[PDB]
From Swiss-Prot, chains A, B:
Organism annotation: Priestia megaterium (strain ATCC 14581 / DSM 32 / CCUG 1817 / JCM 2506 / NBRC 15308 / NCIMB 9376 / NCTC 10342 / NRRL B-14308 / VKM B-512 / Ford 19)
Compartment(s) of residence: Cytoplasm
Protein name: Bifunctional cytochrome P450/NADPH--P450 reductase
Chief place of localization: cytoplasm
Effect seen on changing residue 186 to Q: Higher activity in the hydroxylation of highly branched fatty acids
Site (Important for catalytic activity) location in chain: 266
Consequence when changing residue 328 to P: Enhanced activity with small non-natural substrates with altered product profiles compared to wild-type
GO molecular function, one term: identical protein binding
Impact noted for substituting residue 399 to E: Ineffective covalent modification of the heme macrocycle. 2-fold apparent limiting rate of flavin to heme electron transfer for arachidonate-bound enzyme
Amino acid sequence: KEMPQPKTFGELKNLPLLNTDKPVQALMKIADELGEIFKFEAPGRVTRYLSSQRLIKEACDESRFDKNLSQALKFVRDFAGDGLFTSWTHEKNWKKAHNILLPSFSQQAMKGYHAMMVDIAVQLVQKWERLNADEHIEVPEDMTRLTLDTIGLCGFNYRFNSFYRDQPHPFITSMVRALDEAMNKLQRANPDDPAYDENKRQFQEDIKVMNDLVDKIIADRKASGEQSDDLLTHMLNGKDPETGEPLDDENIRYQIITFLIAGHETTSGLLSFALYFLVKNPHVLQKAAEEAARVLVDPVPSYKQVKQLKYVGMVLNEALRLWPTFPAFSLYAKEDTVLGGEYPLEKGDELMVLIPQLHRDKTIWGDDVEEFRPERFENPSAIPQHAFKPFGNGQRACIGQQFALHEATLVLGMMLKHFDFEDHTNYELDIKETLTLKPEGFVVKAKSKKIPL
Amino acid sequence: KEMPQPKTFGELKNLPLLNTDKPVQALMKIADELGEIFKFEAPGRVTRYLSSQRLIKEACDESRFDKNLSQALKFVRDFAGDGLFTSWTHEKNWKKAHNILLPSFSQQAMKGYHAMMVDIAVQLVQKWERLNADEHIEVPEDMTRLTLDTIGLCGFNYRFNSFYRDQPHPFITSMVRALDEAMNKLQRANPDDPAYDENKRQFQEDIKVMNDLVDKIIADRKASGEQSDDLLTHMLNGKDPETGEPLDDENIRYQIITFLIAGHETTSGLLSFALYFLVKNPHVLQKAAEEAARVLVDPVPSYKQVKQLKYVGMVLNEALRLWPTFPAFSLYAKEDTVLGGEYPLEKGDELMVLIPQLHRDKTIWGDDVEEFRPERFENPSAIPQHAFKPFGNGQRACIGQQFALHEATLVLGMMLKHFDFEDHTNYELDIKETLTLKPEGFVVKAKSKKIPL
Ligand code: HEM
Ligand code: HEM
Ligand SMILES: O=C(O)[C@H](Cc1c[nH]c2ccccc12)NC(=O)C(F)(F)C(F)(F)C(F)(F)C(F)(F)C(F)(F)F
Ligand SMILES: O=C(O)[C@H](Cc1c[nH]c2ccccc12)NC(=O)C(F)(F)C(F)(F)C(F)(F)C(F)(F)C(F)(F)F
């Protein structure tokens, strides 16, 4: 039985297929042509891309497969270290940090973060209230200002003040450039070529910038002793119940860098896609706006009011179905095993879960998988197990899921309460790929409903 | 009596003395050397610089002298046109605009603008509340954000959104570059030298940017009929009592451009100098802060509360004494006349009033004229006529005087209510000159008192 494989480039095998600005979208097209599984080879490396719920449900069995660091994550590890996102499950610091931080990311914890989320959300709305008549909004740029500032503030009581700037904060410049470099390393044949020497030097300079700001943030909080109820305070004080150990300061840095990466890259994309779908589907926008108007009856939304925004939740989940913003995750076989009754795997063999394809599995979702329909999530127990995984799988799933959904629900709810929206350019979806997916160049006009804050 | 005169450069006469980054400060030093009057010659022209109250009181006699357009103002007229600032007193549009606008710039008119002034002032306070512990404030840069935005909003219901940017608005970039070219054209031999073709092209392009935006603003408003009740509304509807004529749309544009020049340049300089002198004089800062705390008992300052900030007003007047931010104005003799019983002048002969030197006249102020003492203004009536002229003279005095002082008082009151200030760099005063004066590089730290808004 021969597993499908895309086109090759002689000795380089499939590698040059990733020499593109849009590798995930390319892989989606290959998946459409080849089906639920294909092998992908490079010099000295092989993986298998999975696209169907029936295979992915097996891949998600944690007794058989564990999280793998893709080559992308191995490069991100050069600045995110053994933080939660780029550590192996068997490294002592994973379970330790996981145990310490899980309570700080719970739904109940969101009650405590809510006030600071509102602070940044109000800044966004005020920005849009203050635009002149025929000016427009640069959507992913503003969502990124919001999401980065929220995690900065909620997490570590640090204000990036992104709405006060055109040029990002120096940490963000370095982080964005470090991420770009990490993703660019995947797609260059002969990575030791002299041309890439300057890229490597700038990389080391960006890592240093990140470490020095965050180390300083940690040291400052240690030296002040201030008990600001946030992630940083929790990490400086908390002990892992299992080992009885706290995180050391180096690992705390790695977690902070990791949360900032997450806040910048991934939540902003969700909000950007959600707004994109709303302006392309005005009946959905109407339903979401009506809910926002009916529910958010006070100038400052409450935690309880955000929980009440069911339809806005459904909008966000349908946006995640179509464009899960961190679109692939990797697994390895813990032991020899056979996938799907058909594909034998050896210990250590790697799998890639193509989340956007899983979410277009017609045998699960129906034939209309490209349509934006939030009512797919109106009665969510209808969704089969492992059919919807925008936040990954099992113990290695996104720790920030509740944070991200709370922020996104609050913000999207406020946006729909306060403004009508116009797709003035009839924007053509163009998806930029970094660590994540975003709708590049998405612009709208927002006409104020003149409801005070 | 042969008039004193500074050093000459052969056939260039005194012209090269103004070929300096700091021409007003140069002229002040010359005044120190030469006294109350000196002649200043260049090829094809002459003026006389006055520095004493004794002589300036004659110059300010409107039966004997009228406002002259200095060469600097003649160049500003290429983009400010026949707006109030760059028009001759005998021009029909001067008298029309004067009669139409003056009542809208009264102390009592400020009740109408107060709310919009608070809007921008709160944005400033919030920016500074949001700075992190280690960070500092770029004072003139932030003061200019405030003052430009205030005149934009109050004047024409237009939001430059300066607190949302590092890059100034396109209009501002052009205006600033226009004003720079005007300044540069002064110290320049042959204007039609092909060398300056690019300068002229840039100049024309900046005029276009300025006219296009402002004309659109005006046209947009005329269309809607929206009675926004600002300077633009008054200008579109208002009739000159004398002629019975309104301003035409072209002249309205020049007034708006003129207001924007004014609210950008001179007013922010005042606030920057005031804060400078406050941090250099801690006892004065403390007295002003006591008043602010005693008077501004509400989170939103009221119009009447700003009028009660007597000491803050004294502080601003003392800043204006030392560093009047539009530091000189020009006059011409309406008829042959003798100045000071010594200097015969012919009809058309020109004078320059060197305001910073007038304000250092030891016969009026006492020997300690370099000292910052707001108490000099305990009773502003006590100052002799024509001794204190930071807003110029007579019917050609600053129309924006009450606007500027109300805005500056409000803002400085709020700053002193909400923050303690630290001169963390022990800043060395360095005054940059364009057509106005500012303390370049003035930076402070502001520690919040944590009083909510
Ligand atoms: C819409 C927003 C987000 C999406 C779609 C998303 C998606 C994901 C996915 C798919 C994974 C699994 C990665 C893998 O298997 O390799 C993951 C892991 C993670 N995410 Fe997110 N994420 C989001 C927001 C956030 C936020 C806001 C934070 C933190 C502030 C965060 C922190 C993390 C961390 C720490 C992990 C690693 C968890 C572990 O292995 O222990 N994420 N995320
Ligand atoms: C600290 C702030 C300010 C200072 C020191 C200042 C100073 C002056 C001075 C000295 C003049 C006389 C010019 C001459 O004789 O050639 C003047 C004129 C003028 N100023 Fe200001 N000014 C300030 C703020 C403003 C503001 C905020 C506005 C408008 C919003 C404004 C509008 C004008 C206008 C229109 C004139 C021309 C008046 C006329 O001749 O009819 N000024 N200003
Ligand atoms: O980084 C990796 O390991 C894998 C695949 C890969 C990269 N190099 C390989 C060599 C042989 C076989 C497979 C690979 N990379 C990808 O699938 C990808 F295309 F880069 C990717 F999809 F864009 C991605 F990196 F996974 C991603 F989607 F951007 C990421 F967000 F990181 F998951
Ligand atoms: O613009 C002018 O006409 C006059 C005088 C002048 C400029 N060029 C001259 C040649 C010969 C004799 C006099 C002059 N300029 C000045 O006095 C000046 F102070 F140098 C000035 F800086 F240019 C100034 F323009 F006056 C000023 F001070 F910057 C201004 F803000 F405009 F008042």
